[PDB]
């Protein structure tokens, strides 16, 4: 039964990653926190 529960539990996690898109923001914000500031640097090339 333990094994059954364990197997079932694993499948739910995959579904929980197959469903929710907002969980992984803790990674993606980091990517955004490089994809945001860098771009602004380029815009300071157009300051008189």
């Amino acid at each position: 039964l333990i094994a059954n529960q364990f197997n079932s539990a694993i499948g739910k996690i995959q579904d929980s990653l197959s469903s929710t898109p907002s969980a992984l923001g803790k990674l993606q914000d980091v990517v955004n926190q490089n994809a945001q500031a860098l771009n602004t640097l380029v815009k300071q090339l157009s300051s008189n």
Binding site: V42, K43, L45, S46
Partner: protein
């Protein structure tokens, strides 16, 4: 000349680089091109438009 690292002076505006043909369709009024950094990247040639 195309695809050559050269010095250009188009209508006063100067610089260096390589020149190629764009597939860009302007409006008949439009002449220049500018970037995010407010830099030139696409120019209409004064002789052969």
């Amino acid at each position: 000349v195309k695809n050559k690292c050269v010095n250009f002076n188009f209508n006063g505006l100067t610089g260096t680089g390589v020149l190629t043909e764009s597939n860009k369709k302007f409006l008949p009024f439009q002449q220049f091109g500018r970037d995010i950094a407010d830099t030139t990247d696409a120019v209409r040639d004064p002789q052969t438009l």
